[PDB]
């Protein structure tokens, strides 16, 4: 597998998840924004450890594996698209069609028997809400809705976001995001103060284990996720004490937000409402390789017309993006990086000492282990 068998045997509750160091194969993943790739201008990227090339031909997106079948070089070292529908390797000129990856010509040996008998791996690509999703999997893809949080694809939902590469395994990003008690790191958030938001330091759980979360095994669209319900019977903590004496307090804002938090396979978090009562935040932690992920952030707001979308776009660039996506979430970034060492040798998955609020994370680990569509392995990446 991807992890020492001795460790996998130990984590009987969620071995597939611990083994999924490279992410889950056979799911859709957003990797860039539509306006980032123009007609006839191939773009490179790495997803689930695989180097890919994406091109826009006649407005439509196509995805080919960035690895020549011949000597395994990346075609992108020197891109040569000699006809609108093909790409020619810069080394010995093996030429492939973007449409189906078939080897259709070899400039240096036009009559080779390999022509029409070899095919470069291709992956489905779909655009939605200005986002570019790639189905990193085999066979016919399921509807995109299965791998997106509820409402993301709503007709009136206006989506704007930001994307960047963060140095941590995708799972550490997922868990931090869905961690009920991690809000402690945001106690000094400027956003919280300026937007007058109510933000406790944490929650004293109430009720039984089962009431702490709400697991969704299937919307009519087949999505799988978990809602964090620690606040349904829990007591929000606003005064932090040590030895019985107050040493810290939470935010007593009047605006109540983020009362709806859910994590969905393949790894996208939905926080609603946030950062404002009329908005929603959806963020993906896309696996690039075992040590890196794309932190694909998006903010949604229902807009009924071109005027509202224009206004939203304005507040996004001037306020939400800088104050929320960057200001508030920047703390999440270094928090993720801080867990790298403990989990790097895979030992942290055994030595971690969890407490009550981690019930949410446990539910996610079990959901992911039970309903993922496949474990990406090194064999998929290279493999002989």
């Amino acid at each position: 597998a991807n992890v020492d068998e001795a460790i996998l045997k130990r984590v009987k509750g969620w071995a597939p998840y611990v083994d999924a160091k490279l992410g889950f194969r056979n799911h859709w993943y957003p990797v860039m924004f539509s306006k980032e790739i123009n007609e006839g201008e191939p773009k490179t990227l790495k997803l689930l450890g695989e180097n890919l090339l994406v091109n826009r031909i006649d407005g439509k997106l196509y995805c080919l594996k960035d690895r020549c079948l011949h000597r395994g070089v990346q075609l992108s070292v020197k891109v040569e698209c000699k006809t609108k529908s093909t790409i020619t390797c810069w080394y010995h000129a093996w030429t492939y069609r973007w449409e189906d990856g078939v080897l259709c010509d070899i400039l240096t040996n036009p009559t080779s028997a390999q022509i029409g008998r070899q095919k470069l791996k291709t992956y489905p690509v779909q655009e939605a809400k200005g986002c570019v999703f790639i189905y990193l999997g085999d066979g016919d893809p399921p509807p995109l809705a299965r791998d997106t949080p509820p409402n993301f694809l709503d007709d009136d939902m206006e989506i704007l976001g930001k994307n960047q590469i963060i140095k941590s395994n995708w799972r550490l990003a997922v868990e931090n995001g869905f961690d009920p008690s991690h809000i402690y790191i945001h106690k000094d958030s400027i956003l919280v103060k300026d937007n007058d938001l109510a933000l406790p330091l944490g929650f004293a759980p109430g009720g039984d284990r089962k009431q702490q979360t709400r697991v969704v095994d299937d919307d009519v669209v087949g999505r799988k996720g978990v809602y964090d319900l620690i606040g349904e019977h829990g007591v929000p903590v606003f005064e932090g004490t040590i030895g019985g004496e107050v040493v810290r307090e939470g935010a007593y804002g009047e605006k109540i937000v983020a009362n709806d938090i859910s994590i969905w396979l393949p790894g996208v978090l939905k926080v609603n409402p946030w950062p404002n009562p009329d908005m929603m935040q959806f963020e993906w932690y896309v696996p690039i390789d075992e040590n890196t992920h794309y932190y694909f952030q998006t903010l949604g707001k229902p807009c009924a017309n071109d005027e509202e979308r224009k206004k939203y776009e304005q507040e996004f660039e001037s306020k939400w993006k800088p104050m929320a996506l960057e200001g508030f979430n920047n703390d999440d970034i270094w928090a993720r990086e801080a867990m790298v060492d403990f989990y790097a040798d895979d030992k942290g998955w055994v030595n971690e000492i969890l407490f009550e609020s981690d019930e949410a994370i446990v539910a996610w680990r079990k959901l992911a282990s039970e309903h993922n569509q496949g474990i990406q392995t090194q064999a998929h990446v290279s493999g002989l």
């Binding site: 130990r10 984590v11 009987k12 509750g13 055994v350 971690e352 000492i353 969890l354 407490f355 981690d358």
Partner: protein
């Protein structure tokens, strides 16, 4: 002080049974051979339920990280567990199984 867990007939040798207590933490009852033992149900190393683990002899293995505890003494039997498990009074009275407070 005791409370009927179940009939000694209900539990087959080598099986585990979770015991919920009103306004109290859950307990786990294990039957090793023909004798009964009881400890807290929650693993001391985390938040897992030992009643969902694997019992081998008098040693219960946690389903989360593989830690283990001796069901008789409640002492750790395998890492990452290091904090002793609480053990409770168990006794069979007329075929029925009963458990009480922590010893």
């Amino acid at each position: 002080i005791w409370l009927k867990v179940c009939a000694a007939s209900d539990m087959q040798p080598g099986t585990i049974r979770r015991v919920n207590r009103v306004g109290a933490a859950p307990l786990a009852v294990y039957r090793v051979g023909d004798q009964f033992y009881a400890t807290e149900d929650t693993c001391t190393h985390g938040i897992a339920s030992l009643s969902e683990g694997t019992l081998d002899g008098d040693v219960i293995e946690c389903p989360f990280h593989g830690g283990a505890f001796n069901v008789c003494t409640g002492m750790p039997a395998s890492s990452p567990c290091t904090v002793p498990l609480g053990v409770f009074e168990v006794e069979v009275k007329e075929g029925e199984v009963y458990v009480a407070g922590e010893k």
